[PDB]
């Protein structure tokens, strides 16, 4: 950095290294979470404040001082495992069901067992959403849920199905340290960003007990 | 002379002791985490500062063995050396818990207010002043420290020659500033913890929980016996009780156990804010790898 | 299009202050190092003052140094340049020059259309031999100029530049370092040189080429410039 | 039933081809390798006036 | 019907004049050339300020700049001599999985999961770096870029395809079709004349640039290969795949020459290159480390043991004077 313009060019680059970490700054407060599960899941609708911005989908809804960033891997149409580490890192994973779609059940546990197993998401939570309450209540009724799970004992009322529904999904965990937290919401709950909000929190409590050295 | 025999006798053997095992598991904690090539999170700057304050403290105790043992013979500039690395130490281990105990309640319980997506959360400032106030508490150790010649034992140790007033005050300094303000900023801060624990969902809160509650009471437990002496011999020199040989025998020997004590607190400072961790024992098993 | 220019200039007295605005349109004003060179009547260039890319660093020249102060507004994207006592000396024509500093740039590309000023009434100095230099088109020529210190530094690089300046325009630049040919001038032109000697060849001289023709050096603050050399068709 | 129809097509294209043994290929990757020994900073140490690093 | 039959005998016949032409390994020819002993490089740079995880990386033509792409939406221009940031281009998007840098140095390219091919320009008047073009057409996730001129760039996806296209058009000038699955890299012949690409399907093809045809097909590898590099002469290249092996493969003779595979390797490769004389083949893994091999004996002749993470891509400037690494915990290092 001796010469007249060698200096001048160190000078750039600490305007440079200036800016990258004002940028990294102004994202800080965001939080990453990864949108999962079949197609007409409602998995484009879950919280009405969208905003949203072929490929990656992203929206980016804020809430209770703090950003949440919301990414759609749906139309990639290719093999997960290549394209899944990319996401490695991401706070929780947002996975959503449709109670509705019996024909389409399979294909989501099928979904939920290999991203809960996958070697890199062996540490994120899974925010599991049972969406379209009152359809599976209509149709339940004209259609007991029999032909969708052979195995099912229990009565045929709408609290008994909901219930072995979400156990099923919950059999997939087979890990410790990861929790599910499911909810059943409905075409009509606006109140979808806070329970994202609650259980992130939990999620942001657990991992700093990690970092903290207090587990 | 039954309390100068039993100093003789055991503490040797028990500072010897002290010095190995705390060498190797403070050496071992501050190692390991010098060998990160990246970042390091706060907890774990303050658990180096810890490390090297007990490394240092730990270091310190064999000289103060030999001054049990006979005499001291490394003249007074040693004396004063030793008096205020010992001071220095303890009291950057006091604040250096407190502010493990604050950070911990930061990240746990404003757990939302503080998110960071994973920059490195820079906390030098707190150590350097932490650094800083502890050298000077330390300073009247370097003004006054000296080696005394004592004509009723023809012994030489490291004593202080302040004034009874003086002596008094440090006393006070050290109870106040080394146990009672930490002792409450760690029940503050754990009790907060657990009370956001108790209220949260997950499978890890339990040994949490359970962590939170051990740390606090070995502290409590092995620092509180020796400053209850202290206060019990604050009361005797202040004119609060009767002065006899069987009581100042009984108050040195209560004294010198309870010192052991809370140095053996140090030395069990790894086993509790650095082995118990997962990422502490991840990295010491990468290390031993390497 | 990139464009500076300058307004400020006029009749002042003895002893006053005057400021002359640069205003930048059609590039990132924030990201150059912007100059100050004037021209005395028919005498040559010389480097006045530099304010920086953020305004981080500043430098005069010795002759002006704390009568003349350089400022930069980059919201506006505008340069300035105030000075407050004024000697017949100062009587010149000012240019906004920009630079941009990073490995392999052209630190001094694009000069301003300059505007007239007129009072009422240890560096290295480089030196050209010859003022004038008569010759015809279609025959090759050569400009030559030398340096007290060897221009050579420790990187490998020689600081040196060659600037052409048309009858009645602004200074262009040729050669930025010692061989590289800057960015839409013609490929003829070529640089060659070992520390202290110098040398610009022209390959089948044109009817534009006609003009003067200065050396500088970037090796150190302050700059300087030569005398220059004229070419007369 | 069409899409087989250019692949058995591409593998008559990629079977007539003119190889060549083994030993003749394996031994042209050794003498180049030998041949540009003398160039290669990372295969023998530089004397390090002539490292840029 | 009859047709799955040909191509059965088709397979077979390949597999009969492949057979034929092996007459000696490739380690049973040079097993009397001494060793190269054991290769001790120690880091020279240690090139730092990205945030997010680095994905990629190129070397310019004139061994001293560098391009670095991160998960932090940067693009970040290094002088690696000084370790200078040259410049700093901020992405639409992301989600970036590859950078390349110009023969030239004028231009600069960057993708990902956009699926969209972004041309920066380098030297422009206005003094900052400018989107020139965005080539759109492929329906998945971008793997690899690289330039053949100022003018046309060769591009693979996950769309099983590859694709070279006109940037001044921004049209599709060739698109190669014929593997069955995600191709995860491609390199360039030295001619830049033909080029080879590494599937996820196992397999690697070569293809003519001129004329969009696929020469040849080479197998072998267990599972998808992740990373591909031209051999210097141009007359072999090497593999890095899942399988925790690397295979070196010859087009004249038509298979596999030799195997870099160890015991103790477990993971898989993430990115290949060689060396200028093309004697030591450098590869990194998942397990933190590059491993060194003797590309003519396959035997490990040393480790750049650096970084605490992922290596995920790996480079060797044009003189062979260094190699850079970087690695998912966001710092690239330069090796002598
Ligand atoms: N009667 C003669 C001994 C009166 C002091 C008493 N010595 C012991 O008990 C044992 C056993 C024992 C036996 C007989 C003779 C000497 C010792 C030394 N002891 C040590 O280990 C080292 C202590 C020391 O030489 C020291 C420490 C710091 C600064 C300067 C000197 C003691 O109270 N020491 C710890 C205490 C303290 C030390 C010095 C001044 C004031 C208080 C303390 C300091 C800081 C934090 C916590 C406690």
């Known amino acids: 950095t001796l010469s007249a313009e060698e200096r001048a060019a160190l000078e750039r680059s600490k305007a440079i290294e200036k800016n990258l970490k004002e940028d990294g700054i102004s994202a800080a407060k965001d939080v990453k979470l990864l949108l999962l599960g079949a197609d007409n899941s409602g998995k484009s609708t879950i919280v009405k404040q969208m905003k949203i911005i072929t490929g990656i989908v992203e929206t980016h809804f804020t809430f209770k001082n703090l950003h949440f960033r919301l990414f759609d891997v749906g139309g990639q149409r290719s093999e997960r495992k290549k394209w899944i580490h990319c996401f490695e890192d991401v706070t929780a994973i947002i996975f959503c069901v449709d109670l509705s779609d019996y024909n389409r059940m399979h294909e989501s546990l099928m979904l939920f067992d290999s991203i809960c197993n996958n070697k890199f998401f062996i540490d994120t939570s899974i925010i599991l959403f049972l969406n379209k309450k009152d359809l599976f209540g209509e149709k339940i009724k004209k259609s007991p849920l029999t032909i969708c799970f052979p195995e099912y004992t229990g009565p045929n009322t709408y609290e008994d199905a909901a219930a072995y529904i979400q156990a099923q999904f919950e059999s997939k965990n087979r890990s410790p340290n990861k929790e599910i937290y499911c909810h059943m919401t409905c075409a009509t709950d606006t109140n979808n960003a806070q329970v994202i909000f609650d259980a992130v929190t939990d999620i942001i409590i657990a991992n700093n007990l990690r970092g903290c050295g207090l587990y | 002379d039954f309390s100068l025999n039993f100093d003789r006798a055991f503490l040797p053997a028990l500072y010897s002791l002290l010095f190995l095992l705390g060498l190797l598991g403070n050496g071992a904690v501050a190692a390991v985490l010098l060998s990160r090539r990246t970042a390091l999170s706060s907890t774990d700057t303050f658990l180096l500062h810890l490390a090297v304050a007990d490394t240092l403290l730990v270091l310190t105790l064999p000289l103060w063995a030999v001054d049990a043992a006979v005499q001291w013979v490394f003249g007074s500039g040693l004396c004063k050396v030793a008096g205020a690395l010992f001071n220095i130490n ?63 034992l023809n012994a030489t140790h490291c004593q202080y020659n302040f004034p009874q007033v003086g002596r008094t005050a440090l006393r006070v300094l050290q109870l106040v500033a080394g146990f009672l303000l930490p002792l409450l900023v760690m029940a503050y801060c754990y009790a907060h913890i657990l009370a956001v624990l108790l209220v949260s969902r997950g499978q ?87 | 299009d990139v464009q500076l220019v300058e307004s400020g200039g006029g009749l002042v007295q003895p002893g006053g202050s005057r400021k002359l605005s640069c205003s930048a349109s059609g590039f990132a004003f924030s990201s150059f190092g912007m100059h100050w060179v004037r021209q005395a009547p028919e005498k040559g260039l010389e480097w006045v003052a530099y304010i920086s890319s953020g305004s981080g660093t500043i430098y005069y020249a010795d002759t002006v140094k704390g009568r003349f102060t350089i400022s930069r507004d ?132 044109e009817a534009e080429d006609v003009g003067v023709y200065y050396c500088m050096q970037h090796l150190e603050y302050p700059l300087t410039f030569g005398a220059g050399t004229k070419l007369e068709l | 039933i069409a899409q087989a129809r250019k692949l058995v097509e591409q593998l008559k294209m990629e079977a007539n081809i003119d190889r060549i043994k083994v030993s003749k290929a394996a031994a042209d990757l050794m003498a180049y390798c030998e041949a540009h020994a003398k160039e290669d900073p990372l295969l023998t140490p530089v004397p390090a006036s002539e490292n840029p690093f | 019907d009859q047709l799955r039959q040909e191509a059965e005998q088709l397979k077979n016949q390949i597999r009969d004049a492949r057979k034929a032409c092996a007459d000696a390994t490739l380690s049973q020819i040079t097993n009397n050339i001494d060793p190269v002993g054991r290769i001790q490089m120690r880091t020279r740079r240690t090139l730092r300020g990205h945030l997010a995880k680095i994905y990629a990386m190129h070397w310019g033509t004139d061994s001293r700049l560098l391009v670095s792409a991160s998960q932090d939406g940067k693009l970040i221009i290094w002088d690696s001599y000084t370790t200078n940031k040259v410049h700093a281009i901020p992405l639409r998007s992301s989600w970036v999985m590859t950078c390349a840098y110009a023969p030239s140095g004028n231009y600069v390219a960057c993708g990902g999961l956009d699926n969209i091919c972004s041309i920066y320009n380098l030297k422009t008047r206005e003094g900052n770096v400018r989107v020139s073009r965005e080539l759109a057409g492929h329906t998945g996730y971008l793997s690899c870029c690289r330039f053949l001129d100022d003018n046309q760039i060769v591009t693979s996806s996950g769309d099983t395809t590859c694709a070279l296209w006109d940037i001044e058009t921004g049209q599709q000038t060739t698109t190669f079709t014929g593997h069955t699955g995600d191709v995860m890299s491609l390199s360039l012949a030295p001619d830049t004349r033909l080029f080879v690409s590494g599937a996820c399907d196992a397999s690697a093809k070569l293809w003519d640039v001129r004329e969009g045809m696929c020469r040849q097909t080479f197998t072998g590898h267990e599972s998808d290969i992740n990373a591909i590099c031209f ?106």
């Open chain 2, 90 to 152: 303890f009291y950057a281990g006091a604040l250096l818990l407190a502010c493990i105990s604050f950070d911990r309640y930061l990240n746990i319980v404003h757990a939302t207010q503080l998110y960071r997506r994973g920059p490195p959360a820079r906390v030098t400032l707190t150590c350097l002043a932490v650094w800083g106030l502890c050298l000077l508490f330390a300073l009247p150790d370097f003004i006054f420290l000296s080696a005394h010649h004592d004509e009723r």
């Open chain 2, 204 to 290: 890890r809160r339990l040994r949490a929980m359970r962590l939170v509650v051990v740390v606090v009471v070995a502290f409590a437990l092995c620092w509180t016996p020796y400053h209850l002496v202290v206060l019990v011999d604050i009361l005797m020199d202040l004119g609060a009780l009767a002065r006899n040989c069987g009581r100042e025998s009984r108050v040195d020997v209560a004294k010198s156990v309870t010192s052991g004590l809370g140095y053996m607190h140090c030395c069990l400072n790894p086993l509790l804010y650095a082995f118990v961790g997962v990422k502490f024992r991840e990295r010491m098993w990468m290390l031993l790898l390497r």
């Open chain 3, 74 to 205: 980059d919201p506006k994207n505008t340069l300035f340049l105030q000075m407050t006592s004024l000697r017949s000396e100062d009587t010149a024509m000012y240019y906004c020059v920009r630079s941009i500093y990073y490995y392999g740039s052209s630190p001094f590309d694009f000069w301003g259309q300059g505007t007239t000023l007129t009072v009422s009434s240890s560096d290295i100095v480089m030196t050209q031999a010859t003022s004038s230099v008569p010759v015809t088109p279609g025959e090759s020529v050569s400009i030559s100029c030398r340096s007290s210190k060897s221009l050579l530094h420790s990187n490998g690089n020689t600081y040196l530049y060659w600037f052409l300046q048309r009858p009645g325009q602004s200074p262009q630049l040729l050669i930025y370092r010692m061989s590289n040919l800057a960015s839409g001038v013609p490929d003829r032109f070529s640089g060659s040189g070992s520390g202290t000697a110098f040398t610009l060849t022209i390959s089948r001289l």
């Open chain 5, 231 to 336: 051999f210097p002469n141009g007359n072999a290249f090497a593999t890095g795949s899942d399988d925790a092996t690397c295979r070196l493969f010859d087009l004249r003779a038509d298979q596999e020459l030799m195997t870099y595979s160890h015991d103790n390797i477990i993971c898989g490769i993430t990115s290949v290159s060689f060396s200028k004389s093309g004697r030591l083949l450098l590869a990194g893994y998942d397990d933190f480390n590059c491993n060194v091999w003797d590309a003519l004996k396959a035997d490990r002749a040393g480790v750049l043991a650096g970084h605490d993470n992922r290596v995920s891509c790996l480079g060797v400037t044009d003189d062979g004077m260094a190699v850079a690494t970087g690695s998912w915990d966001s710092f690239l290092k330069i090796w002598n």
